[PDB]
């Protein structure tokens, strides 16, 4: 919040939209200001996400943050293949796996 109100910003309208939706669902206890609501929604792992395609926010909140992932051995760059007419097994004229 310091990098928001401090940097010269304030509560966004879209944020209000999402917060209100949560206040209806119960995700954020009513009677509380958006400062407290977005907070409760923040510790929930969720937050107020917009849409880079549109710019309108999302009806509900979406959890985010850093996670450890990995690119496994199998890569289409290798496995993927297709042939037309190739060599055949010497015995029977079948193709080769």
């Amino acid at each position: 919040f310091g990098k928001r109100q401090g940097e010269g910003f304030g509560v966004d309208k879209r944020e209000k939209e999402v917060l209100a939706r949560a206040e209806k669902l119960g995700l954020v206890s009513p009677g509380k200001s958006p400062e407290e609501q977005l907070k409760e929604l923040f510790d929930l792992g969720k937050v107020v996400l917009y849409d880079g395609r549109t710019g309108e926010p999302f009806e509900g909140p979406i959890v985010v943050g850093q996670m450890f992932i990995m690119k496994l051995y199998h890569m289409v760059e290798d496995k993927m293949h297709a042939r037309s007419t190739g060599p055949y097994s010497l015995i029977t004229q079948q193709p080769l796996g």
Partner: protein, 227 residues
């Protein structure tokens, strides 16, 4: 009333803009689109091709250098540059470092129209007698086009490197309740536009608005075939 337009900058890097007031929801209707065009279509720089006298490939180990070849390309793509000349979309750069000296963007040999906004970007840590020679042919373009896509053919040992264009780093618009206006439920548009310095936030907004209105003017005469 009228759209009171404000612009609050900082340097060639940070910048803010404000369009207040506006119709309810309108701020969202305008702010995000320009942002979208901004992060992408904004013309840019940050290298093309890199060469070193001792290197035959991106995996080569240069003596007297702690960093690996591509390991330096990590710093080269992130390198920011601007040509002061609109006519220069391609030139060349030079670099020379001997002995135990810290190779950084500043160590580059200055020339006409070439400008580095981050002299302190570490290139390579050199030890005793570590010699290095470098030449980057930096060209301007738009978007993101990796080395694989763009060829170079500068020489047998010179290799293409991924190109990160669009001097814009990140952008965040904002809608809020403004007090400037007649009615209520109005919007005060704000902008967090960030830039590496090649192009100022003001420039970014300007040309983005240009590409925007331009593509928007493609609506003039259609051809109607009714069922």
């Amino acid at each position: 009333k009228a759209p009171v337009f404000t612009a609050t900058t900082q340097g060639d890097h940070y910048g803010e803009f404000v369009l207040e007031p506006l119709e309810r929801g309108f701020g969202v209707t305008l702010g995000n689109p320009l942002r979208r065009i901004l992060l992408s279509s904004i013309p840019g720089t940050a290298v093309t091709s890199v060469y070193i006298e001792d290197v035959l490939h991106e995996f080569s180990t240069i003596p007297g250098v702690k960093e690996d070849v591509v390991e330096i390309i990590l710093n080269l793509k992130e390198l920011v540059v601007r040509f002061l000349d609109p006519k220069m979309a391609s030139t060349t750069l030079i670099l020379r470092a001997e002995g135990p000296k810290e190779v950084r963007a500043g160590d580059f040999t200055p020339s006409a129209d070439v400008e580095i906004m981050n002299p302190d970007l570490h290139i390579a840590t050199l030890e005793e007698g570590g010699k290095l020679y470098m030449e980057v042919r930096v060209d301007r373009g738009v978007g993101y086009v990796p080395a694989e896509r763009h060829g170079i053919k500068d020489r047998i040992n010179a290799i293409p490197v991924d190109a990160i264009f669009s001097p814009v780093r990140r952008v965040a618009f904002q809608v809020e309740d403004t007090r400037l206006g007649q009615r209520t439920d109005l919007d005060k548009l704000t902008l967090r536009i960030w830039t590496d310095g090649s192009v100022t936030p003001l420039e970014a907004l300007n040309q983005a608005v240009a590409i925007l209105k331009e593509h928007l003017n493609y609506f003039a005469n259609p051809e109607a075939s009714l069922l």
